[model samples]
Target: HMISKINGKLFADMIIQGAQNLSNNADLVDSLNVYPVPDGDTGTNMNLTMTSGREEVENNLSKNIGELGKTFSKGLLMGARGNSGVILSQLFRGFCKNIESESEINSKLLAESFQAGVETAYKAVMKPVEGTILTVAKDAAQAAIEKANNTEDCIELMEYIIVKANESLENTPNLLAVLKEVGVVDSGGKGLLCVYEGFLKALKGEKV
Candidate 1:
């Protein structure tokens, strides 16, 4: 099945599903944290951040992608809790900025949006670290942009994004010594992949 374009309603649905998926696996995500600090709440922070974004979109429920994106970004910004949460919000903030005037989004535009998100997220962090969510997002966005050149199907692009994201997540340990020492992938990266997986499930019309 192919979804050529994404409207505001479908985008909203994706966000909702993404939030649900994160909520379900938040504890697992937290367990992956290797910071040695007791604040192993990356998953909880991200889930709460995603929940805020989902709530905003649900309340607005616009047919316009532009409007929905704006509402989602605003909600995420206001509800951001920790470092991961802040970065997640910045990613969506950049994504929505790219599509602020568009009602529907095609694969090319979606790829660009992902790229924009990476750029924004990288800039948000004073010291951009690899093996974290930023790296995962960058790898996925790059893959999506390349895939967009050959296919206009949004589902296909999303699938590629998910594959690259997982691959990136697996490589996080190699990028960061901390992860290698702990034998776990980056918790933030894992969280981001969860959200992407949710997006794919929604596109496939599968239950969360």
Candidate 2:
């Protein structure tokens, strides 16, 4: 199915579903850390951060899409923990910027917002790495931008973006030596992809 436009309730639903999916797969993401050491908390931080955003919108589904975006951004900022969480918050903050004043969003706006989100997250880091979440987001957003030109359906745009993101995840090991050595993809990238998968599922009317 194609979603031509996103309203307040629909946007809120996507956020909540994304958070739940990320939470459900947090342990899997944690296990994929580049470092073999067991002290990694990227998944945990991301899940917590996403949940905070979700909680903010859970009870306020009737607001405009812009209001919900800002609400989610605020919650994410407050709950952000660890480097990954901080970056995730920044990503969503930028995403909100594109829709902050709009009552609804179309596929083109959504694609632009994704690119904005990637740029924002990249700028937040002093030295962005190629094989991490930044790369996955950049590549995915690029794909979204490209695909949005061909289709107005948000579902199709997201499907293309998710495919590109997964491809980027698979290639992460090649970009980072440590990831190749550890035989794992970037955990943070995996976490973002999980959220995307959840969003797609929700849009498709599938349970998260």
Candidate 3:
């Protein structure tokens, strides 16, 4: 069950699946906002951000992975809405940089791309917090790098990253006081995981 490589169309489909799942569970993500406020729109914003990128990939059906990444990154950047959306777009921008001029990607490159995303997000944020999506993404990328030491299967790599991401998410409240005050983990982190969860499902040939 190891998928060693992926073409652009497959990557695009995976993105679309993640977008659909994120949209479906947006409300759940919104409820996990850092503060107990009325306008906690992280979920909605992330969904919109992902959907913007998803639409570009689903519509164009590019066969080149680099082109797909560039298109998706451009869409996310242009359509980003809020703070979370902007961060997510930056993540995509960093991801695209790793895949530039590449026709396909392996597990090792994927992990590096993910790390690039984390680094870019941190640099973009004025004062990066520890227990938010930044931490989740960082851990996920780290896990991916470790997992790639043995397996080239992208699915397995993603599975390991998801586990690490969920672990980071569960510990978020402990890292940030506001999250503990609200008795909730970071909403942005949860949204990011939900998107990955969807990606896993798609790779497994299950419902996205």
Candidate 4:
């Protein structure tokens, strides 16, 4: 995630890619445990949201973070399906509001961005529940806020939060019994953690 800021457009674009990658992995790890709801497409909704962003970036490469946020948020609002997608879009919408003035992003700005995401998602949901993506994100954001130092490199900072996020993901099954029954964790939480893992992969600059 920290590596995504070559420019705001690129930051947005890489996330779209990362999000898509995450959806694909979620299928393997999360598909079978799904409940039979029309809103069962937690992974599907995420892919749709990212694909929506991908189209926007392809058509327009935005330099301004605010404009970029607006574009991505608009895509999410329009394309969102299921409760999960709506909440995720709201998260981005809130973050974009903060990034509107920013020329760049770093640990502090990124931490604030996540904080905004948590705020947006929590307030928007009528009955905000725990043990889902929100909980994992909130935990990570809290850790980031506490651990972030102005001096830490973006990779190190991201790594710290990802570690915390993973820890949170592991606990999700404890929060939701379905996950515990399936011997897994929350699908959405696992999905988000996979995204961080993918970022960590890119950060390694590895050729594997």
Candidate 5:
């Protein structure tokens, strides 16, 4: 059966799985960066940030998705490092804000949360740049919002989000001059996609 609701336990599992996936593919994400000096630490920073969020989930396990989201967001904020990591934390922080009253989340709520995340993330940056994680999140969230109108299945919404995310990631080079010059996708976008993949896997009860 498809997942129609997400509770704290399921969300925690998603976070843990997402963190693991990011840790596993951090090197690949690093390699995708070629502009802005290409220090290549976006993956590492994001991994560490995600790990912190997962630890918060583990330590403060809750049945209410709202509580879990708050704790996870706090952990990410506290441990956020570098530009990518900070933006990532802001995304989740906004997401948690929207779901703060929910005991469980359905597809509609999930879509709203995703949109909230994009809004918060864009506000976090002084000069928001497209073709990065922000673009990926926005495009995927918008698509999911559209899909949510037709489906209550959280699994279906998440799956659609992943598809949109991947599409957005691939289009990053076209949006950003630096990425086009370097012939590479945005590393931050790749990292965000990895997390979304983990979320989908967790929803399907598949191992990352």
Candidate 6:
């Protein structure tokens, strides 16, 4: 169902591609609350950041893994927008660095990416509030690392991460008073879950 362009030149590039796909494919990315307003640009920012990441990849045809990471990181920095978008971009900036020199992805490497992502999201925020994408991502990353000894299949790993994130997302309204009042979990958290789900589809080698 995805009509948007997708190009992944490295392991981390796949992450960017995944984010783009999630935002553009479906009839709806999520509820209007995820965007909340015409001003909120959750899907738009994510799509733009990811496409920028792809452009960086296109520009560096003979790059090394470190170079690829650098490309992705730079893309995130220069194009990031919205609260959710900024956090997602920072997560990739940290994640690509964590696996910078790797030739290919492994269970350990992916664990590092998840860990780096959660850490970046937490540290980038002034307050590091809970009940948001930060909380969901932290839980998901922890689960991914804990399951490192279990499997290397990308699908299985993604399934674990997404499942954990979904559980955490449901708990968000409990952590953030505003979410409880608004009858929503952190909008960014829900958006992230969709991102993960779409990424998993790609990791499984499936096309839109």
For model 5, residues 1-208, the per-residue Cα lDDT tens digits are 7899999999999999999999999999888876555898999989999999999899999999999999999999999988889999999999999999899999999999999999999988998878899999999999989999999998888989999899999999999999998889999999999999999999999889
| All candidates: TM-score | 0.97, 0.96, 0.96, 0.84, 0.98, 0.82
Residue 85 accuracy (lDDT) in model 5: 93
Task: For residues 133-153, write the lDDT of model 6, one tens digit per residue.
Answer: 789889989988987667766
Of the two candidates 3 and 6, the one with more favorable TM-score, higher being better, is 3
What is the descending TM-score order? 5, 1, 2, 3, 4, 6
Q: Per-residue lDDT tens digits of candidate 1, residues 4-97?
A: 9999988988898899999999999988877535378999999999999998888889999999999999999999978889999999999999
Give Cα distance to truth, residue 119, candidate 5, Å. Answer: 0.5
Residue-pair clash count for candidate 6: 0
Candidate 4 regions with alpha-carbon error over 4 angstroms: 1-6, 29-40, 199-208
CA displacement after TM-score superposition, residue 202 of candidate 1 (Å): 1.2
Which of 2 and 3 is the better model by lDDT? Answer: 2
Q: In candidate 4, what are the lDDT values of residues 113-174, reduced to their tens digit?
A: 87898898899988877888889989988887876655345567678889999899889878
**Per-residue lDDT tens digits of candidate 3, residues 1-208?**
7788877876787788888899998999887775435377989999999999988877777888899999998889989977788888998799888897888898899889999998898999998878788888898989988998888899988899999999999998998888887788898889899889887887776776
RMSD of each: 1.0, 1.4, 1.4, 3.1, 0.8, 5.0
lDDT of 6: 0.69
Q: Whose lDDT is higher: candidate 1's or candidate 2's?
A: 1
Clashes of each: 0, 0, 0, 0, 0, 0
List residue ranges in candidate 3 displaced over 4 A: 35-38
Worst 10 residues of 2 by lDDT: 31-40
Backbone clash pairs in model 5 (N, Cα, C under 3 Å; residues 3+ apart or in different chains), count? 0
Q: What value of lDDT does candidate 2 attain over all alpha carbons?
A: 0.88
lDDT of 2 by residue, 95-196 (tens): 998899999999999999999999899889898778888999999999999999989898888899999999999999999888998788999999999999
**Pairs clashing within candidate 4:** none
- Candidate with better TM-score, 3 vs 4: 3
Candidate 5, after superposition: displacement of residue 169 in Å?
0.6
Candidate 5, 181: how far from true, in Å?
A: 1.7
Quote the lDDT for 6 in model 2. Answer: 88
TM-score of candidate 3 relative to the true fold: 0.96
lDDT of each: 0.91, 0.88, 0.86, 0.69, 0.92, 0.69
TM-score of 2: 0.96
